[PDB]
Amino acid sequence: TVKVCVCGGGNGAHTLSGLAASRDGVEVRVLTLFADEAERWTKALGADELTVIVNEKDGTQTEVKSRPKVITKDPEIAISGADVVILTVPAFAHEGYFQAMAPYVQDSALIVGLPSQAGFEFQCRDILGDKAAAVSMMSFETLPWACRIKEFGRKVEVLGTKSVLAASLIKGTAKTVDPLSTLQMLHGAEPVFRLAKHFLEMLIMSYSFVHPAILFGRWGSWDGKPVPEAPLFYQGIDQATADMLTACSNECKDVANAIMAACPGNDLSDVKDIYQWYLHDLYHAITTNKSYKGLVHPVKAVDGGVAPDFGNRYLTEDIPMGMIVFKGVAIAAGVAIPSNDKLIMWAQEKIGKEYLVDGALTGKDVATTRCPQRYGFNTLDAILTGKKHHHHH
Ligand SMILES: NC(=O)c1ccc[n+]([C@@H]2O[C@H](COP(=O)([O-])OP(=O)(O)OC[C@H]3O[C@@H](n4cnc5c(N)ncnc54)[C@H](O)[C@@H]3O)[C@@H](O)[C@H]2O)c1
Numbered sequence: 278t279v280k281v282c283v284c285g286g287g288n289g290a291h292t293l294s295g296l297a298a299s300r301d302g303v304e305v306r307v308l309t310l311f312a313d314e315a316e317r318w319t320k321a322l323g324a325d326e327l328t329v330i331v332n333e334k335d336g337t338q339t340e341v342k343s344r345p346k347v348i349t350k351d352p353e354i355a356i357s358g359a360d361v362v363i364l365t366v367p368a369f370a371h372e373g374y375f376q377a378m379a380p381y382v383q384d385s386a387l388i389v390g391l392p393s394q395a396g397f398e399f400q401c402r403d404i405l406g407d408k409a410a411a412v413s414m415m416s417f418e419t420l421p422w423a424c425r426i427k428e429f430g431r432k433v434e435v436l437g438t439k440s441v442l443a444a445s446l447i448k449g450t451a452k453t454v455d456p457l458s459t460l461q462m463l464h465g466a467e468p469v470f471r472l473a474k475h476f477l478e479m480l481i482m483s484y485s486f487v488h489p490a491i492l493f494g495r496w497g498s499w500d501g502k503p504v505p506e507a508p509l510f511y512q513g514i515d516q517a518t519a520d521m522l523t524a525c526s527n528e529c530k531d532v533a534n535a536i537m538a539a540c541p542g543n544d545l546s547d548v549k550d551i552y553q554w555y556l557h558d559l560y561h562a563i564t565t566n567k568s569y570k571g572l573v574h575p576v577k578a579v580d581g582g583v584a585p586d587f588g589n590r591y592l593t594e595d596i597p598m599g600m601i602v603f604k605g606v607a608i609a610a611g612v613a614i615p616s617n618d619k620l621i622m623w624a625q626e627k628i629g630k631e632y633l634v635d636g637a638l639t640g641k642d643v644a645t646t647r648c649p650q651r652y653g654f655n656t657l658d659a660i661l662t663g664k665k666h667h668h669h670h
Contacts, residue, residue: 279454280304281463282359283345284374285366286314288424289391291433293365295329297463298343307348308355310373315350321430322348330427331435356381360454361463363389365420367590368598368647371397375404384411387453389444389460391417395480396602396647398447402663403652409663414447415456416479421468439468441556445479446472474544477606477661481533481548485599486525486617488591489624494518495574496585497623503582511569519560524616526551532603535610540657587627596624597646601632605648608638609657 279302283294286309298305309315322344329341349355356362356378364374371390382388382405390397393416402409423436446456461470473479494514526549533548552559563569575586600621607614613636621633631640638650649660659665 278302278304279361279459279462280306280359281361281363282306282308282355282378284308284362284364284378285370286311286318287366288426288433289365289420289422291327291426291430292329292422292424292435293363293391293463294345294348295327295341295343295433296465298327298345299329299341300463300465303463305343305345306355306359307345308350308352308374308377309348310350310352310377311370313350315348318348318430325431327430328432329435330432332437334437352377353381358383359386361387361389361459363391364393365391368392368394368397368594369645371400372404375401379405379408382408382412384408384449384451385453386451387413387415387456387459389415389417391421392419393417394419394483395485395599396605396649398476398480398663399602399649399652399654399660400647402654409449411449411451413449413451413453413456414476415444415460416446416476417442417444418479418483421464441471442468443471443473443479443482445476447476474547477536477543478533478545478548480606481529481545481603482554483599484526484529484551484554485595485603486620487522487551488595489600489620490518490521490525492574492585492587492591492627493620493623494521499585503579503584505582507573507576507583509569510572510574511566512564512572513574514560514563516560519558519563521616521620522551522563523559525614525620528607528612528614528617529603532607532610532612532614535612536606536657539610540661543661592624592628596621596628596630597632597642600624601638601643601646601648604633605638605646605650606660609649609655609660 281297281303283290294305294307297303326342326344331339397416398414401414422438425434427434457470457472533545537545575589576583577586630642632643632646634640638648654660
């Protein structure tokens with residue numbers, strides 16, 4: 278038996294629970310701490326089976342029916358004996374799930390952020406304390422699927438599934454179930470998973486600057502006058518924004534290189550240029566992507582047209598659970614990242630938050646971020662190993 282705990286109750290959690298419980302030999306427990314969402318899920322499901330509708334790209338559709346063993350808000354029930362603990366929620370919820378699982382997580386547990394995405398390991402090391410060096414930590418670059426719930430607790434739709442997907446790993450002292458293949462088995466044939474060389478590679482390759490950069494490209498020195506309708510998102514970028522993305526991507530390499538120079542045995546060679554990343558030139562590569570057709574900026578109705586809607590996950594997530602975390606790493610490496618910095622400073626004010634001030638992580642809301650320094654990881658080796666330096670005597 279491969280005992281799996283799925284944390285969350287959103288789109289991904291529905292899909293994962295559905296796809297995972299359908300696998301032979303797997304026991305799925307759903308943990309959700311958001312009020313009484315578990316109780317709402319159970320009551321909604323009843324005695325029926327959970328349904329996942331997959332568009333095969335292209336083989337029409339597929340009916341996947343399965344039932345988890347239990348759906349609970351009690352971490353004791355969901356986490357005890359769990360071989361794999363997978364977090365599929367927006368990163369702001371991650372704190373609570375680590376806190377709830379901590380007294381119950383077994384040494385051989387594989388802890389997976391699906392996503393994830395930045396500072397996930399630092400947060401895990403902090404909350405789980407001494408047990409963090411025992412468990413394994415796995416960080417996936419994004420969600421496996423474009424998916425949405427069609428009916429709460431009962432029905433979820435997969436619009437499309439990724440071809441390839443990468444995940445990083447920090448091995449603990451405990452032997453877990455095999456990370457890559459177990460996660461593959463749970464997901465079926467697609468997406469085909471690959472193991473990234475290093476967790477910092479994954480963290481930097483998340484390209485946290487992208488959405489803040491695109492928003493800065495379209496609304497940088499925005500006069501405060503409306504536009505006829507919602508302008509194109511990715512396909513609506515200018516040349517200067519394509520340069521801006523290149524600048525920030527080079528800074529990513531700079532931090533990677535400096536980590537590799539200062540710390541041998543840590544392979545960060547798969548940290549890439551954003552143009553070189555895919556899976557003519559950068560500008561045209563973004564604009565002529567049929568995966569970006571008809572995707573528009575977040576807009577709200579105002580006087581004489583529509584204004585940008587800055588209250589969105591492009592900044593509320595991607596800054597504190599992305600750019601700040603990369604800035605925290607940059608500081609420790611001794612690499613100024615001016616282009617990244619300028620984006621942080623701008624996106625900061627737009628959401629009414631403050632993390633970075635004069636190139637230093639002293640902002641009012643820096644505590645709600647996952648930058649290593651927030652948790653006390655102030656050196657590169659403390660970032661890499663999770664061990665804080667203690668001198669005597
Ligand atoms: N769903 C997609 O098609 C899509 C595609 C690619 C990437 N992603 C990424 O995957 C991640 C997860 O996606 P999702 O669609 O499952 O997210 P979601 O928005 O659907 O998940 C919402 C869930 O978060 C939890 N939650 C919300 N508010 C909370 C709070 N107040 N306190 C405690 N818990 C709370 C609840 O369990 C809720 O069910 C996101 O970061 C997103 O950027 C999503």
